Amino acid sequence: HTVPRIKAITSKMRMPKSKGATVLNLEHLLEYAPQQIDISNTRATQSQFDTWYEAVQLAYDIGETEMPTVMNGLMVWCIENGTSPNINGVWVMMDGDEQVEYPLKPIVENAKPTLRQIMAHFSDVAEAYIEMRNKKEPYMPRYGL
Amino acid sequence: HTVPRIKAITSKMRMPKSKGATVLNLEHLLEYAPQQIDISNTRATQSQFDTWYEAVQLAYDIGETEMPTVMNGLMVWCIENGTSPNINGVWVMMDGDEQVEYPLKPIVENAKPTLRQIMAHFSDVAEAYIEMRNKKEPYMPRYGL
Amino acid sequence: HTVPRIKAITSKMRMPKSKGAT
Amino acid sequence: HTVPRIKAITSKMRMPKSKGATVLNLEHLLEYAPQQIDISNTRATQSQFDTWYEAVQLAYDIGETEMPTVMNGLMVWCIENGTSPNINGVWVMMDGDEQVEYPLKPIVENAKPTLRQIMAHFSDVAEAYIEMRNKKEPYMPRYGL
């Protein structure tokens, strides 16, 4: 007659218990679907990224309107070079053919808990940039961010 | 009818965000294509090369017109011998068959952050010189710059 | 457009002060 | 039938004895549960804290209603700087941008048995203050209280 479709929460399944009650809240557990990247520890939490991005802008004294153009070069620089640079060093982003130097102290010192996890936010755009140039000319990099 | 060509910046791709806004400036990110050697940390930045080249010319007291001929010998000397020489030593470049001695103190002391990265500028011409002689006589070297 | 070149004397840097003046 | 549950006070366990009787009072020993911080010697006893707090308020001649606002600055000052300051010195707490100086003689002289143990009372709020600011801006300190 009717085909028995099995349920996801079987009756004979041990929900965790504490003093009789259940520690879980299995009516909204099914209505709880976060993205695999927004609850992963491989990326720094948005609060810690809002601090690194704000503690770097103050060290450079760059205005909020001129701030984002700097972050284009920072990712591109972090593509050839790894996310473990010299804290007593500088990174370069060009105004055409002229090199512009930026200190690496606020970048590494203010990145918590690790510069790798702070730079992991740029991972989505890093692939979108490497592949975009590979169409024109080879851009086989040395490290990643 | 029309074939759907995919875009590089997909709609469902996580641009990094800070307080709602976007840290990147993805309208000039695509119009930003620097050379892989001018934003790499394996070579000293042009400002630091403009300092080493100017702090060495003063120690030798060599005029700006006689200065570049010295740099021919320095690279050739740095081909057989590595970029980590004795600071209390000399390097040689010939006026034909007669040896001419130059101190190695301004070369190593004034090279920041490392003599290897300062000498990495000569990498393009180093290959163009080794291969040019290999046509005439073997020039299998011992180190590089 | 234009690359922001940082200055040596940042605005948020504590110049020594004496009775208001520097 | 019935599962034998073991007792905490086993019959074959040597209660300390003195002249036949028992030195312990093992009927209220089980009904005696103090906090691990209120019987620990790492913090000065409340009687000695009631003396230091009262012997400092008299030296500053500060009223009891204006007294507690001073203790906010004292802990914050004791976060960057350790609990072993110069007795012939002063500590600072701001009325906005204007420094206010307070002598360090009543703070150190009247703290028994050690200023570290007297300042150990503020340990619970010290973490609650460092973490609260770390959300806004980095507050990586140098010592603790």
Residue numbers in the entry:
A (entry chain Aa), B (entry chain Ab), D (entry chain Ai): 42 to 186
C (entry chain Ah): 42 to 63
Wording from the paper:
Potyviral CP plays a role in virtually every step of the viral infection cycle, from transmission of the virion by aphids, virus assembly and disassembly, regulation of genome amplification, protein translation, to cell-to-cell and long-distance movement. CP consists of a highly conserved globular core flanked by two large extended regions with a high frequency of structural disorder. Here, we show that we can control the shape, size, RNA encapsidation ability, symmetry, stability and surface functionalization of nanoparticles through structure-based design of CP from potato virus Y (PVY).
Because we found that 19 C-terminal residues of this construct, including those of the α7-helix, were not defined by cryo-EM density, we prepared another deletion mutant, CPΔC79, excluding these residues. The VLPΔC79:h filaments had a similar structure to VLPΔC60:h, but a better-defined C-terminal part. The disrupted RNA-binding cleft in CPΔC60/CPΔC79 thus lost the ability to bind RNA, and consequently the RNA-binding loop S125-G130 adopted the conformation found in the RNA-free filaments VLPh and in VLPr. On the other hand, the fold of the N-IDR in CPΔC60/CPΔC79 resembled that found in RNA-encapsidating filaments, consistent with the CP-CP distances along the VLPΔC79:h filament being closer to VLPh+RNA than to VLPh. Thus, disruption of the RNA-binding cleft by large truncation of the C-terminal part of CP prevents RNA binding and also leads to the formation of monomorphic VLPs. VLPΔC79:h filaments are compact flexible hollow nanotubes with an inner channel diameter of 5.4 nm, with thermal stability higher than that of wild type VLPs and comparable to that of PVY virions.
